[PDB]
Subunit: 325 residues, 2 copies
């Protein structure tokens, strides 16, 4: 396949796009919806089919003023773990900022009792909050399998470290519970990670050529949004921060001449040829945003192929232009 | 062209779909967005292109509690009148129901000072409310030109007539002011117009074969939602209700075996061949709505060709199935 085989932007008005190619021959898609009020799934046999795929709501936010999970439903990811579907997402009990001017999200998990994850809301049950030793702002969780274990990777505020959030990892006791104390892998520190907000968020994991590559997003969700990357040997101690190497420069960023601003909160999938790696990310096409960029709904989902360098590292290149007619 | 050339649903999660093919060949699209908080426009060179067309916000709702136009921005239509762009839309000052359990919408108009209607929000000016002699619930306004005059057609509640709204016509003094007293063209009365809720709304006008054909939607918005049609000779007194003929049966209804439930609030356009008439409407693929139905976002935009009967009347057929892969 080639980039031009896909009509971009693939999915309008969907941020934090997550695509999972399942064994049933379907691509499953989850993302943040503009009103941040529910979790819906789309499915199609092809990536282009997702642009017209009728969604199904499988979980709705709790009522206003009812406590946990009642506001700002962010970045759900659908995972298939030991034959069961799980969705990891973040939510807050309020839209109010705390005394540090931050969002009040925590991490949640829902589990499906059916082989079809899109049949009905009644098939999904809440496990509640995925707790961490320190109860602070946490979001954008993802999971990956390595060394016959399940790892959980997420973004969280540490009061002792400057900025909004750092990336952590921990091994899981089960799909909704941590077994180990969190380990910090990266914090915002370079100029490209600290524009408007000091942020490391949106982790995603790729496994290839004897290594795990963990991409993440940094800076605010406007034009400054960019992707960084950590690398680790697949057999190392994943819970030792010295096992991981951090890229000093972004691995993916704005392509300003073609009006692709702030690419980020990515995921990875495979094309319909079963071989080409695909980068899935959101991106904006203008910068004259009014108000908070999180409430402008025009982060659009993009998909494009990526390749591999001779040293076995990924080469993401740059955002491709829109090509709809 | 043929129905299979279009990937349906054309535009997911857009209700009250309005497509206008401009003299430069662009297809412009306006609709109610699921959060009902703004007016955005998409443009593409093809109807399928609209599925991936990056929207632009051209007008946003007024702040909460500030009065007119502050809530529930519904059903915008983009019209090109005497070389200027106008958008007719409905809005409320509140989300609360009136003492009769009804929505509190009134009709509004904005005008653009630029040839490009998607350049900037600063290009649009508010004309305010389009006032009617009785100040009651009103929405879904459309306009058409006939006999060198401009006619305004809309839906409005009459306290003396059972149901949520009837269809009215009036001649306009200018694009934001009525010249004549409203004339009622149809009220909900047939069995197929009064299922669960008594309503006539979403008017649309088609001109062909010496007649104007005014379609509208009736009944509740589940599988009972259906389209009616009025017919009048193109040279008749359009303000005399006795010039108009009401179809005693619906002209378009649910296609129950393929789960196309409740087609309505239509508009009309022309295909890329410049010849084939296209019906544009919203429709659901399920009716088992959970939570507040106002915020279930899955009314999807459908497009399909229609044809003409021997007597010069349109034949809409029935909803086509989804055909995305
Ligand atoms: Mg994620
Ligand atoms: Mg309309």
């Amino acid at each position: 396949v080639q980039a031009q085989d896909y009509i971009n932007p693939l999915i309008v008005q969907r941020a934090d796009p997550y695509i999972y190619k399942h064994t049933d021959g379907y691509y499953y898609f989850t993302a943040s919806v503009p009103a941040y009020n529910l979790i819906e799934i789309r499915r199609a046999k092809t990536l282009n089919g997702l642009a017209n795929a009728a969604p199904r709501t499988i979980w709705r936010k709790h009522p206003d003023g009812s406590g946990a999970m009642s506001q700002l439903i962010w970045a759900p990811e659908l995972h298939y773990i030991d034959g069961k579907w799980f969705i990891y997402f973040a939510a807050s009990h309020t839209k109010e900022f705390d005394h540090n001017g931050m969002f009040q999200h925590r991490m949640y998990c829902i589990e499906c009792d059916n082989p079809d994850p899109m049949r009905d809301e009644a098939d999904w049950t809440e496990h509640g909050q995925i707790e961490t030793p320190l109860d602070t702002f946490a979001l954008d969780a993802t999971v990956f399998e390595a060394q016959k274990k399940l790892y959980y990777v997420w973004a969280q505020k540490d009061p002792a470290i400057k900025g909004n959030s750092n990336i952590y990892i921990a091994e899981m006791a089960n799909p909704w519970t941590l077994k180990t104390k969190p380990v910090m892998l990266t914090k915002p520190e370079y100029d490209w990670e600290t524009k408007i907000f000091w942020v490391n968020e949106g982790p995603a994991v790729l496994h290839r050529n004897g290594r795990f590559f963990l991409t993440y997003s940094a800076s605010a969700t406007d034009e400054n949004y960019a992707m960084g990357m950590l690398t680790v040997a697949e057999d190392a101690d994943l819970l030792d921060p010295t096992s991981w190497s951090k890229s000093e420069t972004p691995v993916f960023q704005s392509n300003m001449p073609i009006k692709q601003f702030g690419p980020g909160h990515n995921s990875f999938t495979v094309a319909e040829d079963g071989e080409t790696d695909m980068l899935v990310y959101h991106c904006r096409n203008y910068t004259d945003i009014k108000g908070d960029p999180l409430y402008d709904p025009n982060r659009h989902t993009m998909v494009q192929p990526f390749t591999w360098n001779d040293d076995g590292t990924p080469n993401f290149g740059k955002p491709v232009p829109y090509n709809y007619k």
